[PDB]
Amino acid sequence: TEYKLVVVGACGVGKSALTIQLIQNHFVDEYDPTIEDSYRKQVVIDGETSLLDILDTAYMRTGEGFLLVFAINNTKSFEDIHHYREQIKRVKDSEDVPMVLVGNKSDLPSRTVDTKQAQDLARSYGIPFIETSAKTRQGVDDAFYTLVREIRKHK
Amino acid sequence: TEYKLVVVGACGVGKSALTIQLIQNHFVDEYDPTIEDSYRKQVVIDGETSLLDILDTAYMRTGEGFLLVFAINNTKSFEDIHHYREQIKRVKDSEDVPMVLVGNKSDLPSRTVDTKQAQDLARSYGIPFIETSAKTRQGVDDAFYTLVREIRKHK
Ligand SMILES: Nc1nc2c(ncn2[C@@H]2O[C@H](COP(=O)(O)OP(=O)(O)O)[C@@H](O)[C@H]2O)c(=O)[nH]1
Ligand SMILES: Nc1nc2c(ncn2[C@@H]2O[C@H](COP(=O)(O)OP(=O)(O)O)[C@@H](O)[C@H]2O)c(=O)[nH]1
Ligand SMILES: [Mg+2]
Ligand SMILES: [Mg+2]
Ligand SMILES: [Mg+2]
Ligand SMILES: [Mg+2]
């Protein structure tokens, strides 16, 4: 009932925004990118009281679940996804580590990374893909909760 | 060729969900209830290129069409329908304003407001009644498009 989650991705994709929206239920219009802190919150996932220990990157090997986050209006971030994917494989020494691909900023119309690209990437990793928006709370809880559901399976 | 539409109803009925599903063609599992923003999208209604200016309540007097939205699994929302109905009559100072009654969340089985009650209410207002689901896109376009068709006959 206690989970250690880790949010990874390129700078400016909304790693901090997604975390704060989950923890403090509000949207941050700006957040210091050099800040890397762990956050804590007792929540209810699928009716079960769970403790979430989330690390907003800017221990790693103590992570049970990982959020691969990019922005749908940021091609470069999507390109950097594989870099972080492989880091997690090495730090965990495993092929099968609970992960979720996250497409943030789905509220923005200036989309450059279409659905097929993201879903093909997730298909190449065999992990779920969720479109999120930290501004509007869209898919935010689902992203973290799905990861926890992935951990439940592995454990 | 341009239309100003206003979506009203009780909190949590899916006003935001119905708007996003129309504009960005996706479903929001959660949306900040305190967010009231105007949205814009050029669409094709019955073959005719139209610009839709939609206000998602949480400007009013400039509304040409109004969506009266409740949830079929929300008796209270249905009860509050007349409240918003009369507000629009006052803000427009008119006895005849293009409106459409919308029963959202039709994808849910836990129904408490049957078709009889809704249709009887729509008949009491002399306006169309549309069953919608922002989750599955059911009746979403038809709801907004019908309202536009109501504006057409009105002018
Ligand atoms: N429109 C929109 N903007 C976002 C969203 N998430 C984050 N942002 C913006 O992106 C900027 C950088 O986000 P941040 O969380 O600091 O990126 P980080 O480097 O991964 O921590 C912030 O100023 C946010 O306002 C979102 O879902 N929608
Ligand atoms: N099953 C289902 N859920 C919906 C539908 N429309 C909205 N919802 C859910 O209802 C919740 C609140 O909807 P929202 O649009 O924020 O209500 P608002 O206060 O009118 O803006 C959201 O978390 C949606 O997931 C629908 O058609 N079907
Ligand atoms: Mg940050
Ligand atoms: Mg491209
Ligand atoms: Mg809303
Ligand atoms: Mg009854």
Side-chain angles (χ1 to χ4, degrees), chain A residues 1-58 60-154, chain B residues 1-58 60-155:
Chain A
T1 59
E2 185 171 352
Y3 306 88
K4 294 185 180 63
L5 307 184
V6 177
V7 185
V8 297
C11 181
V13 302
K15 296 184 302 297
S16 298
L18 286 172
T19 302
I20 300 304
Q21 182 61 257
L22 182 78
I23 304 302
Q24 295 181 338
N25 288 322
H26 72 82
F27 170 60
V28 288
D29 59 337
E30 187 182 6
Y31 202 96
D32 195 329
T34 64
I35 293 186
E36 176 168 343
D37 187 26
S38 60
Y39 303 88
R40 214 179 191 92
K41 185 181 181 181
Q42 172 183 324
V43 301
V44 176
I45 306 179
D46 305 325
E48 191 169 80
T49 299
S50 308
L51 179 58
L52 299 185
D53 191 26
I54 308 176
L55 174 62
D56 177 33
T57 65
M60 193 65 53
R61 52 189 174 93
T62 59
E64 300 177 271
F66 294 81
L67 284 183
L68 304 176
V69 183
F70 71 98
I72 61 104
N73 71 326
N74 197 332
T75 296
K76 184 176 182 177
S77 68
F78 181 83
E79 299 169 342
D80 286 18
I81 288 296
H82 190 72
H83 169 54
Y84 303 104
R85 161 83 157 101
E86 297 300 319
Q87 282 187 342
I88 301 170
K89 304 183 74 172
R90 294 191 300 268
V91 76
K92 298 296 298 184
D93 194 78
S94 174
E95 311 287 346
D96 184 32
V97 181
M99 289 174 302
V100 170
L101 182 63
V102 176
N104 199 31
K105 302 182 180 180
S106 298
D107 59 276
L108 300 185
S110 52
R111 190 188 202 94
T112 58
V113 185
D114 51 45
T115 303
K116 187 178 183 63
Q117 289 180 230
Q119 286 188 342
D120 283 331
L121 179 57
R123 221 179 300 187
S124 301
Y125 293 159
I127 63 181
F129 164 69
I130 303 181
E131 294 184 353
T132 63
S133 175
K135 180 180 181 180
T136 66
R137 305 178 179 172
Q138 166 201 347
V140 174
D141 284 26
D142 186 28
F144 290 88
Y145 290 1
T146 301
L147 183 59
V148 173
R149 300 182 188 102
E150 297 298 308
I151 301 181
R152 291 171 172 171
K153 298 166 57 183
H154 189 280
Chain B
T1 185
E2 302 183 7
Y3 301 90
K4 306 187 194 66
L5 307 186
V6 178
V7 186
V8 299
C11 181
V13 301
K15 294 183 300 298
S16 298
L18 285 170
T19 303
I20 301 305
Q21 183 61 257
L22 182 82
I23 306 304
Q24 294 177 325
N25 295 280
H26 74 83
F27 172 61
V28 285
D29 56 337
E30 189 183 4
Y31 201 94
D32 194 331
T34 60
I35 291 186
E36 177 163 343
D37 189 28
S38 177
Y39 303 91
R40 211 179 194 93
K41 182 183 182 181
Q42 170 188 331
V43 299
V44 180
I45 306 178
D46 303 326
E48 190 168 87
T49 301
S50 309
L51 177 57
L52 300 185
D53 199 334
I54 303 180
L55 174 62
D56 176 33
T57 61
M60 188 69 176
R61 52 189 170 90
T62 62
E64 299 178 350
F66 295 82
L67 284 183
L68 306 178
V69 181
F70 70 98
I72 59 103
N73 71 324
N74 198 330
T75 294
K76 179 182 177 62
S77 69
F78 182 80
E79 299 171 346
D80 284 20
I81 287 296
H82 189 72
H83 171 59
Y84 305 105
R85 164 80 163 100
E86 299 306 306
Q87 285 189 343
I88 306 172
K89 291 183 62 179
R90 295 192 303 267
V91 74
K92 299 296 297 184
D93 283 324
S94 176
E95 63 285 328
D96 183 30
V97 178
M99 302 180 198
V100 170
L101 182 61
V102 175
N104 200 28
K105 306 183 181 180
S106 300
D107 61 274
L108 299 185
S110 50
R111 190 189 201 94
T112 57
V113 184
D114 53 49
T115 310
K116 173 186 60 60
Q117 301 177 230
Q119 287 186 352
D120 287 330
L121 180 57
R123 282 179 171 88
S124 302
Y125 294 158
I127 63 180
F129 163 67
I130 312 297
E131 288 188 347
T132 63
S133 175
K135 180 177 181 178
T136 65
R137 305 179 173 172
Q138 168 205 343
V140 174
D141 286 23
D142 187 29
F144 290 90
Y145 289 3
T146 301
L147 182 60
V148 172
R149 299 183 189 102
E150 296 294 314
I151 304 180
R152 286 174 174 170
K153 300 188 305 176
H154 203 263
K155 70 181 184 63

